[PDB]
Amino acid sequence: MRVFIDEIARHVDQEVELRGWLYQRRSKGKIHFLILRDGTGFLQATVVQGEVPEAVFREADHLPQETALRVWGRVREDRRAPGGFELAVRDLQVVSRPQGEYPIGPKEHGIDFLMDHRHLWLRHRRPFAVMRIRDELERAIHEFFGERGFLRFDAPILTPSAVEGTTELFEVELFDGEKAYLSQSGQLYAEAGALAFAKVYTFGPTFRAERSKTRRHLLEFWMVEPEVAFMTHEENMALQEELVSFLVARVLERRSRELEMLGRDPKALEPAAEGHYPRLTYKEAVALVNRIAQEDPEVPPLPYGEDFGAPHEAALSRRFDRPVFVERYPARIKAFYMEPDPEDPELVLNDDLLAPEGYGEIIGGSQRIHDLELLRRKIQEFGLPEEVYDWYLDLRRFGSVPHSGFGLGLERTVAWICGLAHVREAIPFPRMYTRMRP
Template structure:
């Protein structure tokens, strides 16, 4: 009878049965006539027990010489093991070493500096910690997509090359685009989602975005992934409710499907279990007053820095929504507050535990003349936004949307010290290799 190839995640269902296991040896130790192989296969980690009496002198000698990250195919029997995190181990009956590395694996169990690890990111991804982080990231992205499909949104893939600047011209990468002239790597897909929501009502995207910011903080990447949503006829209040529901759903599903990964990362699960809508809210004006009372040197109109966001959010166990920022501190497309035109109907969602802004959002300007005035005030060329102005000429309606930073969300949920671990291959101010 032929044996079945079983992945680590399913081994608990095959206790007492003989199986085939295909993976890599990420560590080993041997003692006399027995070797303990730490195995991984992309779905988890398990221990293999190799005994000289079972395998014979020659095979056991090869196992004792095996290097970390050798690829192997094993025939073995699944055995219950209460000491194992997954409850089982494999008794090795036969082993085929497909590839034995020519030299010792560079990432050993000893401590390595971050520069070394980033230089070897293509190999560092194989480590247990990185495996668990990216498994959580996968569940976050899965939950994002599910949330929108469950709520009747349509996926719109927005362009990477764009002739229209969505945020700030000073933070763009520009490229010569054949005979067309200069175009930019997208900072956001928002403007295109605004066009699409006039066709489909409720739309979202998920893809890479680029910010040419010379920032070296633990919260910033040059290339990062963003989820954006846009909904026709949604008010500022509708928009904030949508954001709360999205974050609550993401947390719920990650706890449901990836709790073991969070535990492996030593994440305090109890803090995440408290994240359920509704979230606390305050206006920008109230935020400035709170900061001033706490001794911070900040005036109305100043931007909120990382230390300000951390201080504000530290008062709450859930994400904090700060709304209605000064008009001059925000992008040109944000709708002025009819009760106070000096502020706009926008919000930032600040994650607790010092992780800062994870969502930026606003109700959009939907009247052509107001948008023209804001373009002029922002010194942006009207001709590059003719198509965007068209949206205000033909059946314009109030509409709102937001952008969720995937890596910041991953960093917060996993409890990471730096955002560079939240993406497979980080692009930072000084790194584009590997």
Template sequence: MWVYVKDLKKHIGKEVELRGWVWRSRSSGKIAFVNLRDGTGIVQVVVEASSVSPEVFKNTKMLRLESSLIVRGKVKEEPRAPGGIEIFASEVEPIQIPKDDFPIQKPDHSIDYLMEHRHLWIRSRRQVHILNIRDAVLKAIRKFYWERGFVQVDTPIFTGAIGEAAGNLFELDYFDYGKVYLAQTGQLYLEAACMALGKVYNLGPTFRAEKSKTRRHLIEFWMNEAEVAYYEHDDNLKLQEDLVSYIVKYVIENAGEHLKALGRDITKLEKVEAPFPRITYTEAVKFLQKKGYDIEWGKDFGGDEETEIAKQFEKPVFVTHYPRKAKAFYMQPDPDNPEVVLCDDLLAPEGYGEIIGASQRIHDYDLLLERLKEFNLPVEAYDWYLDLRKFGTVPHSGFGLGVERTIAWIAGLEHIREAIPFARTLYRVYP
């Protein structure tokens, strides 16, 4: 019976079949030990010369790191073994034994070398733990929306409309149509969808042609966006803090062993519960100025400023009401002060920066048209977007959560490149 390592404790005393790869192996006289990994865990396989055929024992001693193999044997309890169990093999069937040494064996490989061999690096225990945490984050996002009656809407990758700054777009020739862009965001399309379905979200790749080399930036990254009809600013804040709290709790409960294996301090994550603290942009500027930062009202925050603000709190913190001219064209002005908009950035603690950008959207046709012209955007490309304000317009709000930044924060990673299976950074598109 083929079973996975994670399920072996259910089969103690039984004969099982395992399929995997050699993590480590050693032999001494008439006994060999093979640590087998299968993606769900690692187990020690004991191969005794007296219990198997000479050919099987010979094949076992020939195994090298990352050899693929099938093992058949009995599951036995062994407190001294990893996981408290061992396999006493009756058969070892090599599928492939590499001719060359596995390229990743040394503890001191450079990051460039590891990234160049990312297709093999992801087999390492640390990377397996990280990718399991990523899986838990994605499951939590979908589960959160499913439990709350949201509808998933898949938004396009090719778009003719600019959602954010035009300077950060990848431009492509689209047959005879002309220029199109790789999507920076699916927000505009979710706005259309929420007018049909009420509560919607997406989850998929987005692209920013931003020449940044910081530990927080990727060129291709995944984003979860949500949009809700009739939601205003405060409703939007509540949805964001509920989502982030839910994700963190889900990961602790369902991938806690992976967090611990990375050495993550889970006690810090356990404090992440709604409500989150809130400060205005204006309050944040005053705070930073007192801390000696050279920042003027009207300028956006950089990574250092975000870190300084966030380290005052144990939970993520909302920074709200940014200056109108520092944010995107579609954001709703504050009725009490039209120079700021009803928006927020959610900053993660521990120096991980912005994980969510959000706003209430402009729902008035004339005001949106005025903003498009102010930002020098081609009005004809937004005819369909303006239509949403001509037929049944309502206040609505939404946000975008950066999946990799969220993973990096939850897992305690030093660099965002480990938060995605194959990172696309400023100088890397291989493998």
């Protein structure tokens, strides 16, 4: 029967068929050494002369990289093998030979070349591990919220309303000269969903007109955006903590093989899986940065009332063994929808969660304004056209309740967990400022 390498362990001492590709080959003496990939793993295959037809054995000398194979043999247990098993080959059929030289040969390549050949690179072990961890998180997100009786609620991609500032917005031409924007966040719609279904979350693509090539920016990425009716600022942070803890615990438990392949230390992720996340006010945070900055001139200082930069977040996150919250920022550097702190009219009830080891923001959230008139002032204070947000105001006119929510950047979470050098490695086909292909 045809099996998958993923489950070769439960086919020990049995006749099996594999369908896959030739990853590597060495031919010396009276034995061929093969590594086969099938898409679910990598397995050692040995072709010994006598045990195979001479028509086969001569063919196994002229097999280039990424040759398509069908392979028949018996599975044997062996400690000195990638996985602890091997295939003793008995017969072999070639489905196709490479039409040219395989571009990603046994040489070191620069990231630029690798990303130019991303459609081929995805075959290799490191992307293999990443994509499987991405899959694990995507499944695990659905289970988490399903068990909590949350409803998935797909926010529209085409939108008239801006969410996070007029500065960076893509435009789409429609019919008869009409235009619309590409969603930067589906939050506004998630709120409507919240007042309708109590517990909702979006899980769709989002688009920012970013103009940098930093290790944490893409033009296209995926955002998970929960929203809950009646939920406070405090409850929001607790939920975020519950989520991140579960995700990391799930990766540690089920994807330990993949972590190994990425050379990531599990002991550096266990703390994040166990909750008890530290917590700072913005003020305490700015003060801790200014301490670090005075001891290290590479870390820049931060004047109070100014917005955090990546090095600020980076330095701050290295002080903790797990993600740290930063809360109660000044209203003037935040968003129009954010609820004022009842104690201090300068602050809003928001939070960002920073990933450890220098990674920075993985989540941004807040409590929302529920008072109609307060919202109206905020709109035009931010200089936003009131007309466009009239459906958003309806949510305050009818059935208005306190409510909170956040948005988790999936790529950034993937980069952190896998320990990658850039978010572009965390998605199949990245879209950056200067990278629109393939």
